[PDB]
Amino acid sequence: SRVCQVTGKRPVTGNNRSHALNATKRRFLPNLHSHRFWVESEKRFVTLRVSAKGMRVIDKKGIDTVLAELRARGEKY
Amino acid sequence: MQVILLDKVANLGSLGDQVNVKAGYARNFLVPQGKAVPATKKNIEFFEARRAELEAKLAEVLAAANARAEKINALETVTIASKAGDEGKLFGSIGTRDIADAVTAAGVEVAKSEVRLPNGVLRTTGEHEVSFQVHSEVFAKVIVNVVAE
Amino acid sequence: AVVKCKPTSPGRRHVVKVVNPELHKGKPFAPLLEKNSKSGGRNNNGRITTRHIGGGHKQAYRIVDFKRNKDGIPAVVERLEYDPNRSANIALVLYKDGERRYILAPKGLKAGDQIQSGVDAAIKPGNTLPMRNIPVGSTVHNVEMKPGKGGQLARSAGTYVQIVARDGAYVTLRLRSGEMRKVEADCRATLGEVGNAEHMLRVLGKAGAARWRGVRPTVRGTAMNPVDHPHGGGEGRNFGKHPVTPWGVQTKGKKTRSNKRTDKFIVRRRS
RNA sequence: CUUUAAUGUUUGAUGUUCUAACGUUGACCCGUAAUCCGGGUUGCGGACAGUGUCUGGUGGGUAGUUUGACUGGGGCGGUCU
RNA sequence: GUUUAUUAAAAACACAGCACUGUGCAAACACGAAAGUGGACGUAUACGGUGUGACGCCUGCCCGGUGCCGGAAGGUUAAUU
RNA sequence: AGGACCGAACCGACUAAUGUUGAAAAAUUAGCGGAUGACUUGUGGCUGGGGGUGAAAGGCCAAUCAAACCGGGAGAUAGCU
Ligand SMILES: [Mg+2]
Ligand code: NA
Numbered sequence: 001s002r003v004c005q006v007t008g009k010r011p012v013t014g015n016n017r018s019h020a021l022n023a024t025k026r027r028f029l030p031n032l033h034s035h036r037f038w039v040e041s042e043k044r045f046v047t048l049r050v051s052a053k054g055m056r057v058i059d060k061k062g063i064d065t066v067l068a069e070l071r072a073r074g075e076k077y
Numbered sequence: 078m079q080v081i082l083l084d085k086v087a088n089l090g091s092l093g094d095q096v097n098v099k100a101g102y103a104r105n106f107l108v109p110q111g112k113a114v115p116a117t118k119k120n121i122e123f124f125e126a127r128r129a130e131l132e133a134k135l136a137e138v139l140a141a142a143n144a145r146a147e148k149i150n151a152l153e154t155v156t157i158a159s160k161a162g163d164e165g166k167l168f169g170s171i172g173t174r175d176i177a178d179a180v181t182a183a184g185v186e187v188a189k190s191e192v193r194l195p196n197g198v199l200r201t202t203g204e205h206e207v208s209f210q211v212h213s214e215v216f217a218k219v220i221v222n223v224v225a226e
Numbered sequence: 227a228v229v230k231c232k233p234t235s236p237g238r239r240h241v242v243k244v245v246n247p248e249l250h251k252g253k254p255f256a257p258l259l260e261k262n263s264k265s266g267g268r269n270n271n272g273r274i275t276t277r278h279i280g281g282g283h284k285q286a287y288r289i290v291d292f293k294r295n296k297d298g299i300p301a302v303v304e305r306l307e308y309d310p311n312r313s314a315n316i317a318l319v320l321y322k323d324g325e326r327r328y329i330l331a332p333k334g335l336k337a338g339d340q341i342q343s344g345v346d347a348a349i350k351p352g353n354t355l356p357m358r359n360i361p362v363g364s365t366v367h368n369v370e371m372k373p374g375k376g377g378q379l380a381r382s383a384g385t386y387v388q389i390v391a392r393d394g395a396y397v398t399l400r401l402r403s404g405e406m407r408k409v410e411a412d413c414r415a416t417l418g419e420v421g422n423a424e425h426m427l428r429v430l431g432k433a434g435a436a437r438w439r440g441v442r443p444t445v446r447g448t449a450m451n452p453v454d455h456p457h458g459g460g461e462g463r464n465f466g467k468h469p470v471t472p473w474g475v476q477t478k479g480k481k482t483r484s485n486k487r488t489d490k491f492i493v494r495r496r497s
Numbered sequence: 498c499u500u501u502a503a504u505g506u507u508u509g510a511u512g513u514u515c516u517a518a519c520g521u522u523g524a525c526c527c528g529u530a531a532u533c534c535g536g537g538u539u540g541c542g543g544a545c546a547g548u549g550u551c552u553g554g555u556g557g558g559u560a561g562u563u564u565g566a567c568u569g570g571g572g573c574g575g576u577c578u
Numbered sequence: 579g580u581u582u583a584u585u586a587a588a589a590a591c592a593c594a595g596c597a598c599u600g601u602g603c604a605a606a607c608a609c610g611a612a613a614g615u616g617g618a619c620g621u622a623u624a625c626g627g628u629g630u631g632a633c634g635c636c637u638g639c640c641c642g643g644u645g646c647c648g649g650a651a652g653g654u655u656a657a658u659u
Numbered sequence: 660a661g662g663a664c665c666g667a668a669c670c671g672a673c674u675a676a677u678g679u680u681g682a683a684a685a686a687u688u689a690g691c692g693g694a695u696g697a698c699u700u701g702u703g704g705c706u707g708g709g710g711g712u713g714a715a716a717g718g719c720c721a722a723u724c725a726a727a728c729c730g731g732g733a734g735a736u737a738g739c740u
Contacts, residue, residue, distance in 0.1 A: 001612095002549095002611090002612090011611090022561090024560095027611080028549090028550075029548090029549055029550085029611090030549065030550095031548075031549035031550070032548075032549070033519085033548075033549090034519095035518080035519090036518090036519095038108065038109040045536095047535095051549085052549080055104075059078065059100060059104065059115070060117075062117065101517095101518065101544090102517090104517095104518075105516090105517050105518045105519095106516080106517050106518085107517095109517070110517085144516090144517080146515080146516065146517080147515085150515095191539095193539070193540060194524090194525090194538090194539060194540080196373065196374060196412070196523095196524065196525090196539085196540075197356055197358075197373040197374070197410075197412025197413075197414075197524095197540090198358075198412060199345055202358050202411070203395070211515085211516055211517085211540095212515080212516085212540090212541085212542095213539090213540065213541090214394070214395035214410075214540090214541080215394075215395065215514090215515095215541095215542095216515085217514085217515090231660085231661095232660095234660070234661060234663070235660090235661050235662085235663045235664095236632085236662090236663090237594085237661075237662055237663085238660080238661060238662095238663085239594095239632080239633085240594065240595080240632065240633075241594085260619090262619070265616065265617095265618090266616095266705095267608095267616065267617080268609095268615095268616070268705075268706070269608080269609055269610085269614090269615040269616035269617090270609090270614075270615045270616080271609050271610065271615075271616090271706080272609090272705045272706040272711095273608080273609045273610090273616090273706060273711080274608085274609085274616090274706080274711090274712080275607085275608040275609050275610095275615075275616040275617070276607080276608065276616060276617050276618095276625090276626075277608090277626090278626090279616090279617085281697090287619070289619095311618095311619085311620075312620070312621095312624095313620095313623060313624080314623095370523095371523095371602080371603080372521095372523050372540090372541065372542095373523070373524080373540075373541085374523055374524045374525095374540090375523055375524085376523095377621095378602095378603070378620095378621055379602075379603090379621065379622095380621080380622090381620080381621050381624085382620090382621065382622070382623055382624050383623040383624090384623055385621085385622070385623065385624090395541095401602065401622075402621095402622055402623085403601090403602070403622045404622095405602060405622090407602065410540095410541075412540090412541095422623085423623075424623090425623050426623045427623095429594070429595070430594055430595090431594060431595095431632095432593080432594055432662055432697085433579070433592070433593040433594060433662075433697055433714090434579090434593095434594095434662045434696075434697045435594075435662085435697095436593080436594075436697090437662090437697045438697090442697095442714080443580090443591085443592045443593070443697085443714040444592085444593095444627095444628095444714090445591070445592075445713080445714065445715055446591090446592095446628080446629070446630090446715090447627090447628070447629090448628095448629080449590085449591060449592095449715055450713095450715055450717095451715075451716095451717055451725090453717070453725070453726095454713090454715075454717080455715095456557090456558090457628085457629095459717095465629090468644085468645050468646080469598095469599090469627085469628050469629075469645095470627090470628085471607080471626090471627055471628080472627085473558070473607085473608080474556095474557085474558045475558090475607090475627085476645075476646070477598090477599060477600070477626095477627045477628050478598065478599055478600090478627090478628065478629090478645090478646070479598090479599065479600085479645085479646040479647060480599085480600075480645095480646060480647090481600070481601095481646090481647080482600055482601065482605095482606055482607080483600085483601070483602090483605085483606075485546090485602095485604090485605090486545080486546060486547090487520085487542085487545085487546050487547085487604090488602080488603090488604090490542085490545090491602090492602075495602095496602090496622090
C-alpha cells in the first residue's frame with residue numbers, strides 16, 4: 001500500500017471543490033519513492049518505500065535512528 | 078545540506094570544511110563513498126578528535142580517486158604498461174593496472190576498473206579506455222598508451 | 227504459387243490459395259512443440275480486452291529460435307515446415323553437434339543449405355551476426371533492438387530491414403513501415419528477406435475462412451444503439467459526427483504514440 | 498556618493514559531457530530441479546523518463562440536473578410590468 | 579450464414595473484398611486506484627479502430643466551416659515569484 | 660473438392676388451422692429452412708448489474724431487463740386518488 005515507512009503517510013480523502021462549490025470526493029496521495037539507502041552500520045543497501053518528507057527526516061535524524069524506530073515499530077525492511 | 082569533507086573534493090573544499098552541498102549530491106555520491114559526512118553538531122565534535130588519524134594516516138594512504146570518476150581522467154595514472162593487445166582496440170581485456178607501475182605505489186594510489194565483458198563486442202570497430210567505466214560505448218575513447226603501446 | 231480455385235460453388239468462386247510443394251507434408255518435430263491454448267481475447271479478469279478473437283483451428287506452438295545464440299557451429303537445413311502461429315514458414319535445421327532447432331525461413335533457403343551464427347560468418351542468406359559485422363546498405367531480417375534479447379523486427383512473411391547507416395555504437399535501420407530507427411550495433415540480425423512473400427496474394431474467399439483463423443465478425447458502430455457506441459442510433463442511416471472508437475477517442479488521424487522514452491532512437495517517423 | 502571593469506561567489510538560461518539517484522517487460526550467478534519476486538555482476542538508457550502536490554487547456558467518456566405560465570384541449574402564434 | 583427465447587427472419591446484422599487511419603514493441607488499444615493481464619509467446623505481408631460491403635465499369639469537383647495533422651514572427655494566457 | 664445439391668436423425672421456426680379459465684405461463688397437426696459446417700451436442704470452467712455478453716434486435720444475463728434478484732436507507736417523497 002502507498003504508505004511511507006518512515007512517517008506513515010497514507011492516502012487521505014478530501015474534496016475537489018469547483019468554482020460552484022461542487023464537492024466531489026478525491027484522494028491526496030503522498031510522494032512515495034522506493035530508495036536504496038547506504039547503511040554504514042552493516043555496509044549494505046537497505047531498500048525502503050519513503051516519501052520525500054521521510055527522506056528529509058532521514059537526512060536530519062540519520063538512517064540508523066530511523067531504522068531503529070522502524071524495527072521498534074516492526075516494519076520488516 | 079551542510080557536510081564536512083573527509084577528503085578532497087574537486088570544487089567544494091579540501092580536508093575539512095562545512096560546505097553547503099546539494100542534498101542529492103551528498104546523499105547519492107559523497108556519503109556512499111568516503112568523501113564527506115553530514116555535520117549534525119555531534120559529528121563535528123567527534124571530527125575534532127578524529128582529525129589526528131584522518132588528516133595524517135588516511136590522508137597519506139588515500140587522498141585521491143575518492144570515487145574513481147573524475148580523478149582518473151584528470152590525474153593521469155597507470156600510463157606506463159607493457160601489454161599491447163590485438164590491433165589497438167581494447168575489448169574485454171583487463172590488462173594490467175597494478176603491476177609495472179611506479180607512481181601508483183606511494184601514499185595516495187588511484188585505481189581503475191574493468192571493461193565491458195564479451196557478449197556482442199570484439200577486436201574491431203570501436204575501442205575501450207583503461208579506466209573506471211560505467212558507460213562502455215558513449216564513454217570517452219581517448220588512447221591510454223595501452224591499446225597499442 | 228497462387229492457384230485460383232474454379233467457381234464450383236459460391237465460396238470457392240473467389241478463393242485463391244498459396245500452394246507451396248516444398249513444404250513438409252508430415253508432422254512437426256515433437257520436442258520443439260508446446261501446448262498453447264486460445265484465449266478468446268480474454269485477460270485474467272475474464273473480460274474481452276481485444277474484440278473479434280475466438281475460435282479457429284487448434285494449434286500447437288513451435289519453439290522458433292530467435293536468439294540464435296549458438297555460435298560457430300554450422301547447421302544444415304533438414305526441412306521447411308508450415309507454422310500455424312505465424313505468416314512465415316519455418317525451417318528445421320540440424321547442427322553439426324546433433325541438436326535440432328527451428329528458424330524463420332529466408333527467401334531463398336532450401337533443404338540441404340548451410341547456415342551459421344556469430345562474428346565469423348559468411349554474408350549469405352540465413353546467416354546471423356551483429357550489424358557491426360554486417361556491411362552497410364544490406365537487407366536483413368529477424369533483428370534485435372537490444373543485444374541478447376532475440377530478434378523481433380522484420381519477422382512477418384516477406385518483410386526485411388535495410389541497414390542505411392552506421393555511426394558509432396548505433397546502426398540506422400529503415401524498417402518495413404518506412405520508419406528510420408537507431409539500434410545498437412551489438413544487435414544480432416539475420417541476412418536475407420524472410421520468405422513466403424506471396425502470403426499477401428491469398429484471398430480467403432468466404433467468411434468461414436476468416437472464422438478458421440480465430441477472427442470473429444466485426445459489427446459496425448453505426449449498426450448499434452446510442453448506449454452501445456458513440457456512432458449509435460438515429461432513424462435510418464445517420465452519422466452526423468466525427469468518427470471515433472467505441473471508447474470515444476477520435477480515429478481517422480489522431481496520433482496515439484506517447485512514449486518519451488524511446489523517442490531518442492527514432493530518426494524519422496514513417497511518412 | 499555619481500559611474501564602470503572581474504572573479505571565489507548566489508541562484509536564471511542554452512548547450513554539450515558525465516554517473517552516483519532513478520528505469521530496464523537486456524545478459525549471466527545465486528535463494529532454487531521456479532519465464533514470479535528478490536539480491537548480485539554487467540550492459541544500455543540517465544537526472545531524461547516516470548510518480549506525488551499545485552496549475553492552464555481539453556474533456557456527453559461519466560454524473561447530477563434545468564428547459565415557465567396563461568391558453569374555449571395541447572402545440573405553433575400572441576401575451577406577461 | 580445471424581437476428582427481436584414468447585406478435586417482426588427481412589431490404590436489417592454478419593460476410594469474403596476494398597479504402598482510410600493509428601500502432602517500432604514495455605506497440606497502439608482494452609480490463610484494472612495498482613501489481614499485472616489480453617493484444618501475442620504475435621512484430622508493419624502484424625495488430626487495433628472506423629467506413630463501405632462479391633464481382634464488372636467506376637468513384638468527378640470543393641479544404642471556405644467543424645475535425646484531425648504540421649509549422650510557426652507575433653498577441654493573450656495559470657500555478658509559482 | 661465444395662460454408663455444393665435432394666433428403667431422415669439432429670438443429671431450427673416461414674404459412675395456416677386449433678387452442679387462448681389451453682393437454683401446454685409459447686404448444687399440437689399439416690406443410691416449411693439447414694442438414695460436413697460460420698454445424699450441432701454432452702461434461703466442466705470463465706465473464707456480474709452502469710457491469711457482462713451481444714454476426715447489433717436494446718437482444719440475452721434462472722418464465723423478470725432502456726439497467727436483474729435479495730436485503731437495507733425506508734414508514735423515501737406523493738401540492739394526487
Ligand atoms: Mg478487429
Ligand atoms: Na448512427
